[PDB]
Structures are given as C-alpha cells and as structure tokens.
Amino acid sequence: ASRLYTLVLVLQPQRVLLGMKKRGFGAGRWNGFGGKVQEGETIEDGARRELQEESGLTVDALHKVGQIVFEFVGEPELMDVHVFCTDSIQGTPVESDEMRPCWFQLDQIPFKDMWPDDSYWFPLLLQKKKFHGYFKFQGQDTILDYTLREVDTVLEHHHHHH
Ligand SMILES: COc1c(O)cc2oc3cc(O)c(CC=C(C)C)c(O)c3c(=O)c2c1CC=C(C)C
Ligand SMILES: [Zn+2]
Ligand SMILES: [Zn+2]
C-alpha cells in the first residue's frame, strides 16, 4: 500500500529555487517541485513534468539524491517519494496557477514556511549527501517519529510500471 511521488530540488552553489503553493493543499508553504507520478509515465518523466508545469523549467539531468517515505496516522497507504536535485536548468522560472518559483539564498531557506520534514533532510541535501528517510506524520504540522540516514548510493526500487 503506497503511492509514488517525485520531489525536485533546483540547487545552485549559493541558492535554491523553491516554489510557493498558491492554493489548494499545502497553500502558503514553500517546497521543492513535485507531485504524483501518473500511470503511463516513468518516475523521471514525472519529475520532469512536475518541474516543467510548476516552474516552467527544463533540465538536462536529474541526480537521485534520496528517498523519503511518509506515513500518516489514519492512512494505511505510504507515500514513496523519489527525491532528485538538478544543478543545470534551462528557461526562465515562471509561476503556474499551482506554484510560484522564487530563489532563496542557502542560508536564508524559510523552514518555518516549509513542510516540517524539510528541516531534517535539507542539511544533507545541501552537504551533497544522499539519504534515505522516513517520517510518521500526524496531520500536516506534526511529525510523530522519523528515521534519517546518509547513504552511499540511493537504493533502486525497480518500479516496472514506472
Ligand atoms: C514532499 O513535500 C511534502 C512534505 O515534505 C510533507 C508532506 O506532509 C504531509 C502530511 C500529511 O498529513 C498529508 C496528508 C493530508 C491529510 C490532512 C490527511 C500529506 O499529503 C502530506 C504531504 O503531501 C507532504 C508533502 C507534499 C507531497 C509531494 C510534493 C510529493
Ligand atoms: Zn502505478
Ligand atoms: Zn519507489
């Protein structure tokens, strides 16, 4: 019981491009660019699609930086979140109806305005370290427990429908 998602962090040496959810679920919070991997598309096509739709950006390559599992109390189904980062982007960031991209200096990242797990794994992302992580949530604002480990290589899940 799981659902497959992507999260894309556009990360340059001094800055990170985040985006502000403009409405709907998670409105008011800054996040990486991502969403549900649909049926008929691969994980990496889904990551590129969500980045294109949300930021208007194209990337030459995505690096696999980590894997996050979300569990929610009252929901039996886990979120399987494949996390990517990209150094090299093409195009000018422009908002959609869903998301507005903005650049943040790396020491200025607005963790109080982001999802609570971000404070945990973002330091590893910024140190250029790969990670596996798990967060048990109660509601949107509360983490009940977590496990986060640095990994040498991101484990491959072999999803054969994606
Ligand atoms: C990756 O972006 C996040 C994130 O960091 C944490 C998230 O936490 C959530 C917490 C939740 O309770 C729920 C369930 C909603 C109810 C009120 C039952 C969640 O959907 C989430 C999140 O989706 C969430 C996200 C966004 C998901 C992506 C961009 C893969
Ligand atoms: Zn599927
Ligand atoms: Zn997976």
From Swiss-Prot:
Effect noted on mutating L148A: Reduces 2-oxo-dATPase and 8-oxo-dGTPase activities and increases thermolability
Residues annotated for 8-oxo-dGMP binding in this entry: T6, K21, N31, W115, P116, D117, D118
Cofactor, how bound (note): Binds 2 Mg(2+) ion per subunit.
Effect listed in the UniProt record for changing G40I: Reduces activity by 60%
Xref: CDD domains: NUDIX_MTH1_Nudt1 (cd03427)
Binding site for Mg(2+) 1: G34, E54, E98
pH dependence: Optimum pH is 7.8-8.2 with 8-oxo-dGTP as substrate, and 8.0-8.5 with 2-oxo-dATP as substrate.
Motif (Nudix box): 35-56
Entry coiled-coil feature ranges: none
Amino-acid positions noted as binding 8-oxo-ATP in the UniProt annotation, renumbered to this chain: F25, F33, G34, G35, K36, E50, E54, W115, P116, D117, D118
Nudix hydrolase domain ranges (all copies): 1-130
Binding site for Mg(2+) 2: E50, E53
Tissues in which the protein is found: Widely expressed with highest expression in thymus, testis, embryo and proliferating blood lymphocytes.
Residues given in the record as 8-oxo-dGTP binding sites: T6, K21, N31, F33, G34, G35, K36, W115, P116, D117, D118
Alphabetical keyword list: Cytoplasm, Hydrolase, Magnesium, Metal-binding, Mitochondrion, Nucleus, RNA-binding, Transit peptide
Activity modulation: Inhibited by 2-oxo-dADP and 8-oxo-dGDP.
Substitution effect: V37E: Loss of activity
Similarity-based family: Belongs to the Nudix hydrolase family.
Quaternary context: Monomer.
Function field: Oxidized purine nucleoside triphosphate hydrolase which is a prominent sanitizer of the oxidized nucleotide pool. Catalyzes the hydrolysis of 2-oxo-dATP (2-hydroxy-dATP) into 2-oxo-dAMP. Also has a significant hydrolase activity toward 2-oxo-ATP, 8-oxo-dGTP and 8-oxo-dATP. Through the hydrolysis of oxidized purine nucleoside triphosphates, prevents their incorporation into DNA and the subsequent transversions A:T to C:G and G:C to T:A. Also catalyzes the hydrolysis of methylated purine nucleoside triphosphate preventing their integration into DNA.
Protein name: Oxidized purine nucleoside triphosphate hydrolase
Gene behind the chain: NUDT1
